[PDB]
Amino acid sequence: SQSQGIQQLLQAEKRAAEKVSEARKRKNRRLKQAKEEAQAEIEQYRLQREKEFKAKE
């Protein structure tokens, strides 16, 4: 009888914690990838500014 409800409550909190923990890990991974892609574009800008400065000189 009551054991089914006990299991449903415990498993409900476990299911919630899993989906939220995986989505929080995904969020942090996406923000890290945003910073990495940003730095790649920032290096390309720096390199272009250097090439232009050499040409001006």
Binding site: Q2, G5, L9, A16
Partner: protein
């Protein structure tokens, strides 16, 4: 002396009533905790006279649209 007795009785009666109420409420809480300890969700817990349970449970299943877990 009359004031002493009067004030003692008033104070002691007031305190006896309050303490007896608190004692009975904590007695209910002892049982409530012992049963509840067997078990983002939310919950509430309490005590009622048994004769109200049929109407109480049916109203929970009526106010919530068929969805409530009760023990």
């Amino acid at each position: 002396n009359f004031e002493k007795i009067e004030n003692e009785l008033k104070e002691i009666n007031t305190n006896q009533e309050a303490l007896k109420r608190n004692f009975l409420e904590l007695t209910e809480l002892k049982f409530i905790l012992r049963k509840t300890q067997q078990f983002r969700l939310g919950f509430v817990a309490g005590v009622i006279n048994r004769e109200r349970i049929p109407t109480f449970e049916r109203m929970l299943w009526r106010v919530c649209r068929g969805n409530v877990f009760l023990r």
